[PDB]
Amino acid sequence: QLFVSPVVFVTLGVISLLENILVIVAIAKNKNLHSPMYFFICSLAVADMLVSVSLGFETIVITLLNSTDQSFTVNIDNVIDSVICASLLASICSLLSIAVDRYFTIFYALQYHNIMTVKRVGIIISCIWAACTVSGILFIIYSDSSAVIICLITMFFTMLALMASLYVHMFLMARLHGIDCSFWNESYLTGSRDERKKSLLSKFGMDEGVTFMFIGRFDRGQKGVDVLLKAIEILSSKKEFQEMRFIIIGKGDPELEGWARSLEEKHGNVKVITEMLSREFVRELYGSVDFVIIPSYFEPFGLVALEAMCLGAIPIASAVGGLRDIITNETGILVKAGDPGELANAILKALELSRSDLSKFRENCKKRAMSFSRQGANMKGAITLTILIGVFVVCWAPFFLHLIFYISCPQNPYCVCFMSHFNLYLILIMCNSIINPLIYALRSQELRKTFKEIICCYEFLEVLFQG
């Protein structure tokens, strides 16, 4: 058995005792930190400090029982280990609560704010610690049984799979769904929208009207240009077609490539550019076009809608994957995919929307697309959550591998040499309770401010203490 002196367990338990106390006091005393995320972080600091306190308290009790020299050891063992088990389940729940808090505050920011009042968050955190303590007591009673060890190992692989999903989305696929703020900016334009729109419509020789725009690839079962081309055919026979201007861009297959220019010729008010324009001119098009139509059959990332919403274009897209999660009711119009008749109704509905001042609608699109920036506070909380789970996974990894060996290869000589280093895995677990306060401070500017007001009072609650 790997030996480390009992001084370490008591010391590490005290460091986290002071750190996580400072975390809870700071979040409570600061009115700006009364958000649901910091309330789940507050409970995470509670479960973190109870673990390191219980491990330090257990070491003192262990060092006392072997010296004074029974059957009372088993009872205090069943209670100390019950606090560790209940806090571990709460530590997993507090991390998943932040994950749920980050998923909803990113996509459905306002609907989550109304339902997650200051009262309802206290009920959930209370219910989490209720089911965790009840499950913690039953886990320790049947700690040698199979269902308990299979359950805890499963919970670690769940946190491991969620961490792998977060590293793939945030870091690997960073440039896949990340909006570019330095490029998709209205500052690169000049004038008003109708001023730029008349210049664009005169550049193609057209009367001023409601300008719809499609950009993408001409394919038969992917981007959905066939849905839009038949939507123009349906709208062709109507009377409201004369107030519309369509600009379709994208090269694909000659069957649809020729159909686009077939409608461009038989209608005049339709412009078809079978070339791949530079990103600088597509930026200029979004700042002038009234509505951007994205009739995609499959769009995993809403980046195509975010790029147009930054420059004030109002998207008319399908409720498919990424376009579904980005576009709400106030910042666009959604329709069923593959339906050309329903898309024509959205184009007719968008024509009626143009009769009022869309300056607020475009200001909602700019605001909605502005929150998905990598340097924004919304996506920054997801990276803070990825650090919190990646830290918890690494610190608890050797323990759960020892838990796997306990049930899969206890007699194996190689698994025995690993399980004998268990006292190292306890120290690593206690380091999760010390590193976590360092993560909240490093990734929260408001928490460092209230940290300085306490480190200055810790120097001020000492002059009045000695005089």
């Binding site: 491990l55 257990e58 070491t59 063992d77 700690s143 060890i149 323990f399 268990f422 006292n423």
Partner: peptide, 8 residues
Amino acid sequence: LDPXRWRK
């Protein structure tokens, strides 16, 4: 009475 559980 071991440090933590799953020790004996």
